Every structure is written in C-alpha cells, then in structure tokens.
Model the fold of this input.
Amino acid sequence: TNTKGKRRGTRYMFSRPFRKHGVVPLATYMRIYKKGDIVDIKGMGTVQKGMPHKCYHGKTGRVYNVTQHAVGIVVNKQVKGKILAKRINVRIEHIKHSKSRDSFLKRVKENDQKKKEAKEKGTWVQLKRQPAPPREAHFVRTNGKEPELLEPIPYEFMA
Amino acid sequence: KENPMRELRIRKLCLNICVGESGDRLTRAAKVLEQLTGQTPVFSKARYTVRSFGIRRNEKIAVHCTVRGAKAEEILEKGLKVREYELRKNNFSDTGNFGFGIQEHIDLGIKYDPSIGIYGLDFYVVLGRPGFSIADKKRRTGCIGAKHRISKEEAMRWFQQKYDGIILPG
Amino acid sequence: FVKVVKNKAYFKRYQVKFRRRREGKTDYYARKRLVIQDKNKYNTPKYRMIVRVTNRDIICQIAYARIEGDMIVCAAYAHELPKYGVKVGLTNYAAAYCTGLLLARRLLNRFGMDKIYEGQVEVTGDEYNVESIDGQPGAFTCYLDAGLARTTTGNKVFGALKGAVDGGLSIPHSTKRFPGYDSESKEFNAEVHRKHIMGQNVADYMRYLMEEDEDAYKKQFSQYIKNNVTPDMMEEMYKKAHAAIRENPVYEKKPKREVKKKRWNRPKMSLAQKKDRVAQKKASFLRAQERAA
RNA sequence: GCUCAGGGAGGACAGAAACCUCCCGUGGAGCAGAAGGGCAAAAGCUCGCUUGAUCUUGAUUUUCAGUACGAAUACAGACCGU
RNA sequence: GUCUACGGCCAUACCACCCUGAACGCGCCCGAUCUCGUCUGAUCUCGGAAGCUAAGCAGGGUCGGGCCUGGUUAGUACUUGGAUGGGAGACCGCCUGGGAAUACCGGGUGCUGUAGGCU
Done:
C-alpha cells in the first residue's frame, strides 16, 4: 500500500526557501499575539522539536491557549469523516499573518464612522459591497486619424 | 614621504624539527631547542598509519617552536652567519613569508655532544607591519588593504637593502 | 591551470547573512537567548543594561526591546567625569564603579526612588542583595548584557554590575568572576577586593616607578603628572567623586552649535553625467589612436 | 576558544605522501549507520566537572472504528548540573 | 550635513580595482606591575597615549560582474468544461474562460527607531 510516516513526501514542503538558509530573522519571536487571532500555518525546516504534521499545511485557526513556547490553536481539520475543530500545540515559528481580517476590521470601522457621520443630516449611505455592474454608456471621441483596416498574414513554416 | 607607521619588521620565526622518528630522537631534538631557546616547544602527531614511512596513528613525530622577540632576531643572526648572507629564489614564497632549512647545528655555535646527535631545522621567517591585529582579534576580522599587504618583490628588495645579502637565481 | 573559485554560479548561489552579522558585532545566538520573553506576559517591557568597552570611554546603556528598534532611555559615559571633577583615573575599576553608581542613582532619580535605597556610601565590598521593601512598590530590575568579551577573573563589567547592584538595580549574578577571588584556593577576599576598588595596586607601582626611573613613569603617565595628582590624593579624589555623584546625578544636554549647512559628502552622480563620461572616453580614445598612429 | 573537504607557494634527509605557518574556502568534510530534510563566533572540533536517561499527575497528535501498542508535544509540582 | 553605541527589514546592502576625506568620534600602537590563561601579553585581561589618518572606516565611478525591477520572449507553450469534430491509426482543430518560464534589451547600487556628540 503506502508507507506510514510523519515527514514523508516533504522534500519541497518543509524545506527552506531560496536564499533563506541558516540565519533566521527575529521578527516573529519578540512579538506577541492575543487570544483568538486568525493564524495560518506554514512549515519550517529549522524547527525540529514541536513540528506540525504534514497534513496541517496552510490550515487557518484561532488561538485558545497561550503558553511559553508552544501556543495552542484550534484548527479546522476536514478529515474524510467530518469537519472537526481540533486543538493542537504549535511553537511560535510556524505562525503567519493575514491582512484579510485587518481589512475587514478597518472596513467595519469605516462603516461605523460613516454611520455616526451625517446623523443630523439624515442621508442614506451605501455601505454594502455592491457587485461589479456592466459599464455606463459614453461618447467615444475621435479626431484626425482613422481606424486601420487590418488584414491577416499568410502561413510560413516555423522550423 | 614614507609614514613611520609603515615600517616593515619581523613578526616571528618558526623553527620546526621533523626527524621522522619517535622516542629517543624526538627528545634529543627537543633538548637542542631547550639548550638554544630555553622554553617548552609544541609537539605534533601523525595523521594516519602509513606502511611506507613506518608510522601509526597518534604518534609524536615533529616538534616546533614559534620564537618571538629578540631571541628570534639572534637565532636569525646565527642563521645568516651560517648562510653567509645569500639565499635562493625558491626559498622565497609568493606571499612573502620565507623559509630555508639547514643540515647541521654545529655551524651555529652550539657545542656538539656525541650522545645527542645532529639536528637541523628550518628558519621560517614571518615578517610584518603595524596593523595586523584586525586580522586576528576578537571583535572584527576582514581585509587589511592592498597597499598594506607585503609583496615578494618588496620583501626581497627590503632584505637586499637592509641585510646586504645577494639573491642568486635558481 | 586550476579552476577559478569565484564563478558566476557561486555569485548567483552565494547567500549573504545579515548586516550586523557581516560586520561581526551582533551575536544573534546569544542575543536571542538574552532577549527571550514568555508569550503569556502580554507586552511586558524587558529592560536590559548593556556594557561596551572603548579604549577610554565605558559605555553603559539601558535598552528595552521594541519592534521598530530598542530605544535607549538612558546612557552613562566616562568622559563626563571631568565635569563632576574627576581629572585622573579615566578608565579603571574605580571609574567603572563610579559610572555604574552614577547611572544607578540617575535611573532611580528619574523613576522617582531617590530616597529609598540610598546605597552603599562607605564602599567596603561585602555582599548585599536587593530585597523588596514593603510599603513602597516593587523596585526596578533588569538583566546583564556583557557582549563580545570573555568574563575572566576580574573585569570592569563586573565592577559596573556591582555598582548597579549597590545603587539598586537587582541583577542576578554570582561571586566567582570578581577580582580578588582566587582561582585555586577559591575564597572571596573582601580586603583584597577593597584594594581593587580603591586602587592601591596602581599607586604602589606608581611609587615603585618613581623610585626606579622617571622616563618610563612619564611614558606610562604623561598627562597624569600634568594634572598634578599625588597617589595620596588618589584615595581622597574618589571620595570627593562619590560626593559629586551624590550631589547631582541628572545630566543636562549640551546646546548645539549652529550648522553651517554644507554638504561634506560627495554628491551622487547621475545617468546623464555617467553617459557624458563614457561618451567623452569613447570619443577621445578613437581620436587619440588616430593622432598617435 | 575555534573551523572543515579540497587546492596554490615552499623547505637537509623528505619524494605524490611524516611537519610548519602565508592566501582563500555556502559546506562540495563532518553531524553513528541505507536514504531524505537541516546545520558555520554551529547541530562540526577541543576542553572543566556533571547525569534532566530524576520522581509524581493530566491533556493532545500521528494509523484510528476517532480502538489499543510504540513514538512525540509544551504545560502542573518539587529536586539536581554547569 | 555627518559620526558612535544599541537595533528591525535582510545582496538596490554582495566581491575586486581606483580616488578624496575640516571637527567630533571609532581604531593602530607601548609594555606586563597587578586579576587572568598561555612556550611567548601571538589570544583574553590590565596599566596608557610618543606617533599617525598610512592601514581601518565614510562617500563616489568601473561602456565591471552579481542582485532587484519592466519590456521582449508571447496570446507562445499549456490548460477547465463540450460536441455524428476530423483522422485507418498517429495526432490535430473548433466554442469558452484563464495564462507561462528562458535567452536578449532598458533603470538603480538601502531604507531606517532611540540615546550620546561635531559643525
């Protein structure tokens, strides 16, 4: 059948990227994270103790407990049976960011600001994301030049 | 003109003895360096077992002593007195630090004892210049400068100007 | 011949390290283990005290980790000692102890704990740990940061450390790498450590050189004779310097001189100037070859 | 505290090979083994003394029927080493 | 305008050659008398300034290499879905969305938080 294993078929997955070998930056270590933050997992080759399994690459979860070294996260695993909001313990190095939640919070803050604004005026404000409509009719300007009558080309042998 | 912070001078003198024999010859070669300098030299051991030379792994063969100060100048004066102020082209290295080996030690001035034996050595002169602590210090290591490097032609013309020794071709 | 080592494939695949790692100043493997912080502390500022040893000055900075950069809140220097009145003894164990004590008293005066923890005025050398006195809140504490220096038996870094402990900076340490501590018999000698504090081993050898020969004595102490301080004055000078530290610990900044506003740097050469240079070279080479040949 | 594979210049015995320093050296050496990932003031080399391979309770993961066994994860509490 | 110390992002910062540097400032260097470990102050540590910007360091060019970024490659290769679509097979095209990587040619040779100074 197939071989069982923790690190199997991970020649390119957990390997270090191009020109990112050895020296590890200190950005993720000194910063902290609050409880319940959107964190997705990316593997790393320099970390040997407390590694994530190979079937937890690119999974988005939220933090439930904050310990010293390995913080916890509730990842939403989609196994063949059903969907489980399970809990695992991952160290600080396999933690990324996500600008989608930041843009969502800034959009909610801007919508609340526009809701508090013009309350004494009493005007309706378009708040929702209206999907892309077809274009409005407009006048096409032209002067001097004329559209060139293009004609196709004959066949020529490539090789 | 020339800066007095660019005065070339001798850093050290390496003096190694490799007789190719352990036991009595090694300690009688060490007694010669003990009578000459008056200090404990650093021994060296073999690399691996070779059936041609007849040595084994972890066996002391050679012994060296990097002599510094005025003692290195006096031993180099003995070497120039033996070699009568002449050298060869192949003795000089391309970097500048240069060595030459002698056959017997009775020409130096040391009295010959029949029990010790004849032991010669190599006078590996290492020259220098003020400003080679950045090359081996604790904080930073790096380049020291192209004009600060000492060349082979400059070392030969400095030796010919200072010690008045001819350099024969070959 | 041999193969060329510096190949273009080696230039493409050669990975460079960090800037401070190439400069060889920042040791990241020790620095990370110094700046470790638990994640359940929730933005607790970790203060540390950094000692740097120049040839004359002794830099004693206080830092705390921030994501943009570790901002320096205070720093003590050794060249500000002739302002207080320290003419001789610029870089020794006593100057390191006075710099650490001055930094500690300035730090406690800025945080507002000047009256509590007065400190060891009559310096003896005995061990006295910093214990939290009730009523008042918790005292300031930080961690040691020596740097690229081998901690042997006896160092000015440990003298500044002992000065910070006596001033009221609770930094954990042992009594092993202190001067006066014997390596073989292994006992801490307070009377021998007091000799290193006050400087009798320097003054006795100054008197020995004064008995022996004046040339080497002047060569070792050129401007120290010009400052006219006897070795009998050397003991009372630091006793007056301690009172000068106790008088005014805070420092006032210097008024800066007006800038003449000129660019000492060579200005950056543009594409038009580089093209004009290579055009003048390629135009001059052909006409020079035609004029010569 | 240091840097290796491998290579250049040399030296009475001494050569392709015994020993020495001068010049570099992203790893082409080494990290116990077949293999893979990874490692340069190190995870390689040498030193001082040590045994945290110590004891007592949980939770969680890997195959899994979310069942055992083995392995691993930081936490809870004292006690040691440099 | 610029230096030192503590730093983040980590080659627009990297390797070599050449040239210029007022003041602060970093360093070269003299010795071992003490603590210190070594044959030796060669390393570390300590005691200091006779001399110097020579070296170190700062800045700028190399019809420089490397790196970063656009065009070119190119609607080219490829690819989701569909058909009494063709072809003896081999293979190819059509409706519909998306869309490359070289070689080659243009531009550049770091931003930068705090504290302490020079002018």
User: Anything to note?
Assistant: Residues 4-8, 10-11, 14-16, 21-22, 45-46, 48-53, 55-56, 65, 67-72, 79, 81, 84, 86-91 of chain A lie near RNA strand D (CB under 10 Å from a C1'). Helices of chain A lie at 27-30, 99-116. Strands of chain A lie at 39-40, 60-62, 70-78, 83-91.
